[PDB]
């Protein structure tokens, strides 16, 4: 549906975030950071998805100020490491955030994994954070419709965002569908499945007929079922070609075979496993 990579989801307070971005999970601190960003930047990405627990906070934030384009164009994520929930702790957490970003506020923060008992302390510091005007957007990662429920109980703000792990061997069915009726935009981390599907079949035949790379094919499909994506890349022509998914469209028989691939099968933690 997005034309281009300026291409944007407008969230529920009205915030336009873009619906592609560059994930910088795995990417090491420094220069491969600085230098992911900055090409990515270059070659027309509006958004960059990093976290305190990355390490790379840092070589993100001298990309983007070394990438030449405007902050207010540029969309920032982080999040809130597992170690760091509670309420004076995330307050804590976010303003090192900022130190580290060399960022005056985020686009987007979100609590990084829901574990078990903390995350709606977690909440109200993010409330609070997004009142002060110092994020322009708050929500999750990693939660369960249980959790989201449990959370909107006493919530004053209902997450903006749900970023979760999002690929044809985890298609998030029940998950899609519950935060559509919430208003809560489904994004994917790691949406290429770290490479897992390179040379999946049933992918392989999608990418033949339409000249396109697999990679190319899942973020098309990403985009066709309405979830933001944010690929990892650390390479310029990888990273281009990612991006290069706005001249080609899948068919409905295509979608529907990339989402017969499902399995349930998780490359990163399952949420409801990953308690702390």
Same mark, same amino acid.
């Given at each position: 549906? &997005?034309?281009?990579?300026?291409?944007? #989801?407008?969230?529920?307070?009205?915030?336009?975030? &873009? $619906?592609?971005?560059? /994930?910088?999970?795995?990417?090491?601190? =420094?220069?491969?950071?600085? !230098?992911?960003?900055?090409?990515?930047?270059?070659?027309?990405?509006?958004?960059? +998805?990093?976290?305190?627990?990355?390490?790379?906070? !840092? =070589?993100?934030?001298? /990309?983007?100020?070394?990438? =030449?384009?405007?902050? !207010?164009?540029?969309? @920032?994520?982080?999040? #809130?490491?597992?170690?760091?929930?509670?309420? %004076?702790?995330?307050?804590?957490?976010?303003?090192?955030?900022?130190?580290?970003?060399?960022?005056?506020?985020?686009?987007?923060?979100?609590?990084? $994994? *829901?574990?078990?008992?903390?995350?709606?302390?977690? $909440?109200?510091?993010?409330?609070?954070?997004?009142?002060?005007?110092?994020?322009?957007?708050?929500?999750?990662?990693?939660?369960?419709?249980?959790?989201?429920? %449990?959370?909107?109980?006493?919530?004053? @703000?209902? &997450?903006? #965002?749900?970023?979760?792990?999002?690929?044809?061997?985890?298609?998030?069915?029940?998950?899609?569908?519950?935060?559509?009726?919430?208003?809560?935009?489904? %994004?994917?981390?790691? *949406?290429?499945?770290? /490479?897992?599907?390179?040379?999946?079949?049933?992918?392989?035949?999608?990418? !033949?007929?339409?000249?396109?790379?697999?990679?190319?094919?899942?973020?098309?499909?990403?985009?066709?079922? =309405?979830?933001?994506?944010?690929?990892?890349?650390?390479?310029?022509?990888?990273?281009?070609?990612?991006?290069?998914?706005?001249?080609?469209?899948?068919?409905?028989?295509?979608?529907?075979? @990339?989402?017969?691939?499902?399995?349930?099968?998780?490359?990163? *933690?399952? *949420? +409801? %496993?990953?308690?702390?």
């Amino acid at each position: 549906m &997005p034309t281009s990579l300026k291409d944007t #989801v407008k969230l529920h307070n009205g915030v336009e975030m &873009p $619906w592609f971005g560059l /994930g910088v999970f795995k990417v090491e601190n =420094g220069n491969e950071a600085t !230098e992911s960003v900055k090409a990515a930047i270059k070659n027309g990405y509006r958004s960059i +998805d990093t976290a305190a627990i990355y390490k790379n906070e !840092e =070589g993100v934030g001298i /990309g983007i100020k070394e990438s =030449g384009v405007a902050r !207010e164009e540029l969309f @920032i994520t982080s999040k #809130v490491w597992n170690e760091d929930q509670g309420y %004076e702790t995330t307050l804590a957490a976010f303003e090192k955030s900022l130190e580290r970003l060399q960022l005056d506020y985020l686009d987007l923060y979100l609590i990084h $994994w *829901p574990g078990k008992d903390k995350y709606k302390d977690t $909440w109200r510091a993010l409330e609070k954070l997004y009142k002060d005007g110092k994020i322009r957007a708050i929500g999750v990662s990693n939660f369960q419709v249980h959790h989201l429920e %449990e959370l909107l109980k006493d919530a004053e @703000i209902k &997450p903006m #965002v749900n970023q979760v792990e999002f690929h044809p061997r985890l298609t998030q069915k029940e998950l899609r569908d519950y935060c559509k009726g919430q208003g809560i935009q489904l %994004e994917a981390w790691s *949406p290429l499945m770290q /490479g897992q599907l390179l040379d999946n079949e049933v992918l392989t035949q999608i990418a !033949e007929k339409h000249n396109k790379s697999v990679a190319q094919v899942i973020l098309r499909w990403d985009l066709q079922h =309405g979830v933001v994506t944010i690929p990892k890349s650390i390479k310029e022509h990888r990273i281009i070609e990612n991006a290069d998914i706005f001249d080609f469209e899948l068919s409905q028989e295509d979608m529907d075979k @990339i989402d017969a691939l499902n399995k349930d099968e998780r490359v990163g *933690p399952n *949420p +409801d %496993e990953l308690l702390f």
